[PDB]
Design a protein around this motif. Structure first.
Motif, PDB file in Angstrom:
ATOM      1  N   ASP A 140     -10.299   1.000  -9.049  1.00 11.90           N
ATOM      2  CA  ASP A 140     -11.495   1.831  -9.131  1.00 11.90           C
ATOM      3  C   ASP A 140     -11.310   2.955 -10.143  1.00 11.90           C
ATOM      4  N   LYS A 141     -10.818   4.106  -9.697  1.00 12.09           N
ATOM      5  CA  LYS A 141     -10.584   5.175 -10.655  1.00 12.09           C
ATOM      6  C   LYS A 141      -9.304   4.965 -11.444  1.00 12.09           C
ATOM      7  N   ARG A 142      -8.418   4.081 -10.975  1.00  4.70           N
ATOM      8  CA  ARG A 142      -7.182   3.726 -11.678  1.00  4.70           C
ATOM      9  C   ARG A 142      -7.080   2.197 -11.688  1.00  4.70           C
ATOM     10  N   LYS A 143      -7.579   1.575 -12.758  1.00  2.00           N
ATOM     11  CA  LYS A 143      -7.631   0.121 -12.866  1.00  2.00           C
ATOM     12  C   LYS A 143      -6.358  -0.435 -13.518  1.00  2.00           C
ATOM     13  N   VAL A 144      -6.155  -1.752 -13.364  1.00  2.00           N
ATOM     14  CA  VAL A 144      -4.864  -2.375 -13.677  1.00  2.00           C
ATOM     15  C   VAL A 144      -4.501  -2.207 -15.149  1.00  2.00           C
ATOM     16  N   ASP A 145      -5.493  -2.268 -16.041  1.00  2.00           N
ATOM     17  CA  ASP A 145      -5.195  -2.235 -17.472  1.00  2.00           C
ATOM     18  C   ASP A 145      -4.694  -0.873 -17.929  1.00  2.00           C
ATOM     19  N   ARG A 146      -4.869   0.157 -17.110  1.00  2.00           N
ATOM     20  CA  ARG A 146      -4.301   1.478 -17.348  1.00  2.00           C
ATOM     21  C   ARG A 146      -3.614   1.984 -16.085  1.00  2.00           C
ATOM     22  N   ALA A 147      -2.791   1.125 -15.485  1.00  2.00           N
ATOM     23  CA  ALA A 147      -2.117   1.454 -14.235  1.00  2.00           C
ATOM     24  C   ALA A 147      -1.256   2.703 -14.388  1.00  2.00           C
ATOM     25  N   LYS A 148      -1.041   3.399 -13.271  1.00  2.00           N
ATOM     26  CA  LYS A 148      -0.342   4.682 -13.269  1.00  2.00           C
ATOM     27  C   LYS A 148       1.139   4.466 -12.991  1.00  2.00           C
ATOM     28  N   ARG A 149       1.977   4.876 -13.937  1.00  2.00           N
ATOM     29  CA  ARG A 149       3.417   4.897 -13.725  1.00  2.00           C
ATOM     30  C   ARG A 149       3.776   5.957 -12.690  1.00  2.00           C
ATOM     31  N   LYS A 150       4.704   5.630 -11.790  1.00  2.00           N
ATOM     32  CA  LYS A 150       5.080   6.571 -10.738  1.00  2.00           C
ATOM     33  C   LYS A 150       6.558   6.449 -10.404  1.00  2.00           C
ATOM     34  N   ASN A 151       7.228   7.594 -10.297  1.00  2.00           N
ATOM     35  CA  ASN A 151       8.487   7.669  -9.565  1.00  2.00           C
ATOM     36  C   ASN A 151       8.210   7.353  -8.100  1.00  2.00           C
ATOM     37  N   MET A 152       8.999   6.436  -7.526  1.00  2.00           N
ATOM     38  CA  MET A 152       8.752   6.008  -6.152  1.00  2.00           C
ATOM     39  C   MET A 152       8.886   7.165  -5.169  1.00  2.00           C
ATOM     40  N   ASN A 153       9.676   8.184  -5.513  1.00  2.00           N
ATOM     41  CA  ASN A 153       9.828   9.339  -4.640  1.00  2.00           C
ATOM     42  C   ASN A 153       8.552  10.166  -4.536  1.00  2.00           C
ATOM     43  N   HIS A 154       7.568   9.926  -5.401  1.00  2.00           N
ATOM     44  CA  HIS A 154       6.278  10.594  -5.318  1.00  2.00           C
ATOM     45  C   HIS A 154       5.242   9.763  -4.571  1.00  2.00           C
ATOM     46  N   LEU A 155       5.681   8.730  -3.857  1.00  2.00           N
ATOM     47  CA  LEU A 155       4.820   7.906  -3.027  1.00  2.00           C
ATOM     48  C   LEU A 155       5.370   7.871  -1.610  1.00  2.00           C
ATOM     49  N   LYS A 156       4.488   7.581  -0.659  1.00  2.00           N
ATOM     50  CA  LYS A 156       4.879   7.251   0.705  1.00  2.00           C
ATOM     51  C   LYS A 156       4.585   5.775   0.936  1.00  2.00           C
ATOM     52  N   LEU A 157       5.627   5.000   1.228  1.00  2.00           N
ATOM     53  CA  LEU A 157       5.454   3.575   1.480  1.00  2.00           C
ATOM     54  C   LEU A 157       4.776   3.350   2.826  1.00  2.00           C
TER      55      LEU A 157
ATOM     56  N   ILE B  96       0.845  -1.188   0.000  1.00  2.00           N
ATOM     57  CA  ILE B  96       0.000   0.000   0.000  1.00  2.00           C
ATOM     58  C   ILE B  96       0.882   1.239   0.000  1.00  2.00           C
ATOM     59  N   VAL B  97       0.473   2.256  -0.757  1.00  2.00           N
ATOM     60  CA  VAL B  97       1.185   3.524  -0.798  1.00  2.00           C
ATOM     61  C   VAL B  97       0.182   4.656  -0.656  1.00  2.00           C
ATOM     62  N   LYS B  98       0.662   5.782  -0.144  1.00  2.00           N
ATOM     63  CA  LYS B  98      -0.075   7.035  -0.164  1.00  2.00           C
ATOM     64  C   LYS B  98       0.605   7.951  -1.169  1.00  2.00           C
ATOM     65  N   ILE B  99      -0.144   8.356  -2.192  1.00  2.00           N
ATOM     66  CA  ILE B  99       0.390   9.233  -3.222  1.00  2.00           C
ATOM     67  C   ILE B  99       0.571  10.631  -2.646  1.00  2.00           C
ATOM     68  N   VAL B 100       1.757  11.205  -2.845  1.00  2.00           N
ATOM     69  CA  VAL B 100       2.053  12.529  -2.314  1.00  2.00           C
ATOM     70  C   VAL B 100       2.219  13.583  -3.402  1.00  2.00           C
ATOM     71  N   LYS B 101       2.510  13.197  -4.644  1.00  2.00           N
ATOM     72  CA  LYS B 101       2.637  14.142  -5.746  1.00  2.00           C
ATOM     73  C   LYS B 101       1.858  13.637  -6.953  1.00  2.00           C
ATOM     74  N   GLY B 102       1.404  14.572  -7.782  1.00  2.00           N
ATOM     75  CA  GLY B 102       0.548  14.274  -8.912  1.00  2.00           C
ATOM     76  C   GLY B 102      -0.912  14.559  -8.603  1.00  2.00           C
ATOM     77  N   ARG B 103      -1.731  14.576  -9.661  1.00  2.00           N
ATOM     78  CA  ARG B 103      -3.137  14.917  -9.464  1.00  2.00           C
ATOM     79  C   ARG B 103      -3.922  13.822  -8.748  1.00  2.00           C
ATOM     80  N   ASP B 104      -3.357  12.622  -8.606  1.00  2.00           N
ATOM     81  CA  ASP B 104      -3.944  11.586  -7.771  1.00  2.00           C
ATOM     82  C   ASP B 104      -3.421  11.632  -6.335  1.00  2.00           C
ATOM     83  N   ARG B 105      -2.827  12.750  -5.947  1.00  2.00           N
ATOM     84  CA  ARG B 105      -2.266  12.889  -4.584  1.00  2.00           C
ATOM     85  C   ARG B 105      -3.325  12.695  -3.495  1.00  2.00           C
ATOM     86  N   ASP B 106      -2.814  12.263  -2.346  1.00  2.00           N
ATOM     87  CA  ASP B 106      -3.549  12.034  -1.101  1.00  2.00           C
ATOM     88  C   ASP B 106      -4.484  10.834  -1.167  1.00  2.00           C
TER      89      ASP B 106
END
Ligand SMILES: [Mg+2]
Ligand SMILES: [Mg+2]
Length: 89
Positions: A38-55, A8-18
RNA sequence: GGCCAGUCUGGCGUUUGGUGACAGCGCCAAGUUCUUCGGAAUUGGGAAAUCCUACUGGCC
């Protein structure tokens, strides 16, 4: 540490933040793909720099097991993993 | 600190694009310029730069 499949991650940067999401693929030491089923399903998963997530210190065994046994994960299982994670925290 | 590549008026909303700063879209505002007074164009600081503040991504 290193991001893990099903973590599980908490998004901290990008328009999907928080929002909370699930790691579903680790490209390299810097980039992952996330999805919430849900709003981001597997077939169109969101690429992310790990530094823009909180583990978050929670890893869903069902998601990890689904990739090992089947190579993929359903959106239903992602939604269950996140909904179950929120209930316990 | 150095090198490379980027972002830009503010507020609220945002299932869209972007790793991201942001952008796009809806609404309310602000500055600048032009106007035939109906409106039109534009938006960090700068007349401008291989320029500069802040911020973002990468390498060290
Ligand atoms: Mg804007
Ligand atoms: Mg930097």
């Amino acid at each position: 540490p290193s991001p893990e499949i099903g973590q599980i991650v908490k998004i901290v940067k990008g328009r999907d933040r928080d929002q909370f999401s699930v790691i579903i693929k680790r490209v390299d030491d810097r980039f992952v793909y996330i999805a919430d089923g849900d709003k981001r399903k597997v077939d169109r998963a969101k690429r992310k720099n790990m530094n823009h997530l909180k583990l978050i210190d929670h890893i869903s065994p069902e998601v990890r097991h689904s990739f090992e046994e089947t190579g993929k994960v359903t959106n239903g299982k992602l939604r269950f993993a996140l909904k179950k994670f929120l209930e316990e925290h």
